Amino acid sequence: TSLYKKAGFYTKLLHDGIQPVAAIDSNFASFTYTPRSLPEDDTSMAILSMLQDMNFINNYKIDCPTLARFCLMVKKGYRDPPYHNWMHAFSVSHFCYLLYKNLELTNYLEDIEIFALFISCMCHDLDHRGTNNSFQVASKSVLAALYSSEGSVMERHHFAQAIAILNTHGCNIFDHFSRKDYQRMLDLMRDIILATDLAHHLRIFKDLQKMAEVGYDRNNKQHHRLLLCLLMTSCDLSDQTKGWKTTRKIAELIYKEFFSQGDLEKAMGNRPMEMMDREKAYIPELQISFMEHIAMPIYKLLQDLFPKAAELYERVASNREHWTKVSHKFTIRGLPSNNSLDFL
Ligand SMILES: CNc1nc(Cl)nc2c1cnn2C
Ligand SMILES: [Mg+2]
Numbered sequence: 037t038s039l040y041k042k043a044g045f046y047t048k049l050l051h052d053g054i055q056p057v058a059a060i061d062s063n064f065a066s067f068t069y070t071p072r073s074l075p076e077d078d079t080s081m082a083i084l085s086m087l088q089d090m091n092f093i094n095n096y097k098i099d100c101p102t103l104a105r106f107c108l109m110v111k112k113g114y115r116d117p118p119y120h121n122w123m124h125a126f127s128v129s130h131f132c133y134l135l136y137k138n139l140e141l142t143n144y145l146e147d148i149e150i151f152a153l154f155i156s157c158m159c160h161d162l163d164h165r166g167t168n169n170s171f172q173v174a175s176k177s178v179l180a181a182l183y184s185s186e187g188s189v190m191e192r193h194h195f196a197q198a199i200a201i202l203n204t205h206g207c208n209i210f211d212h213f214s215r216k217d218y219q220r221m222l223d224l225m226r227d228i229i230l231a232t233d234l235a236h237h238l239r240i241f242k243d244l245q246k247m248a249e250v251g252y253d254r255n256n257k258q259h260h261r262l263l264l265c266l267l268m269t270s271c272d273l274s275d276q277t278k279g280w281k282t283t284r285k286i287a288e289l290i291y292k293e294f295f296s297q298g299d300l301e302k303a304m305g306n307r308p309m310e311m312m313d314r315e316k317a318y319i320p321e322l323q324i325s326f327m328e329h330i331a332m333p334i335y336k337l338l339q340d341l342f343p344k345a346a347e348l349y350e351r352v353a354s355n356r357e358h359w360t361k362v363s364h365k366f367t368i369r370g371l372p373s374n375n376s377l378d379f380l
């Protein structure tokens with residue numbers, strides 16, 4: 037139940053050819069697209085198509101068989117917990133592509149900062165175990181021994197797995213890069229992946245909110261850092277910007293994952309956080325708190341920096357209103373016996 041499998045320890049992706057984005061879906065480059073609707077078997081092809089459409093394969097002379105290998109490795113690098121799996125990384129990468137297509141990202145960040153955001157989105161949760169940073173420490177895992185004294189245990193592990201993929205035979209997509217440009221990529225990936233820790237978001241919100249108040253700067257080497265942090269978090273929480281049904285399904289997956297951790301903590305004789313205890317958690321209230329405290333403030337800041345991002349904030353606020361309206365038809369704590377929220 038808390039046991040999540042790793043599948044392991046290519047020609048059919050190139051013999052067919054890289055697909056133009058509209059052949060995947062006419063609505064593929066829209067904020068109304070639901071990347072989770074795409075069959076899992078088609079996602080590797082979609083990543084190639086997005087890189088081809090953002091003109092990253094040509095601008096960096098990436099070897100297509102190597103890119104095909106790297107994408108398959110990154111995909112295989114994910115376990116199967118209910119939420120922190122490959123489909124999550126794929127949908128997060130798709131939102132990065134949507135930000136590129138819809139917001140004028142080049143007018144705010146360097147091209148290398150955008151290509152690193154996409155590759156980081158693909159890698160940001162590699163080898164996630166369906167448990168948070170506190171559980172790593174409590175279970176005295178190999179990852180906590182390695183990174184707990186440094187902070188952000190899982191995030192440092194995700195970055196280490198990405199680097200290990202880049203050091204695998206025929207998977208180094210940055211192999212032709214100069215030593216100066218190979219190192220620039222690694223550094224942006226470390227900071228971008230580390231920004232996915234929500235504890236890091238609580239620490240930089242005061243700086244985020246102030247940058248939104250004063251206003252952004254493009255020649256400023258720093259401003260690009262608080263922005264990369266906000267944009268990475270925007271991709272990570274992008275399921276909140278979709279329809280009510282996506283938000284409902286994501287709540288169902290993240291709480292199924294949280295409650296499995298809770299049950300493991302109880303089995304170790306420890307008391308889990310309220311939100312991870314199936315006997316204490318009230319999903320609608322927890323979802324509304326997360327939307328009010330975490331998600332909405334992020335999308336509101338994104339709107340403050342990019343006017344065209346207003347539709348995203350509006351959808352998050354609308355989804356939160358829907359959760360308040362339906363809480364009446366949700367009287368129980370935890371999840372139903374079938375682990376489904378389809379009844380709402
Ligand atoms: C990180 N992504 C998340 N997505 C959703 Cl729907 N709820 C969350 C998190 C983190 N905490 N909670 C309550
Ligand atoms: Mg993560």
Ligand SMILES: [Zn+2]
Binds near residue numbers: 124128160161232272
């Ligand atoms: Zn994630």
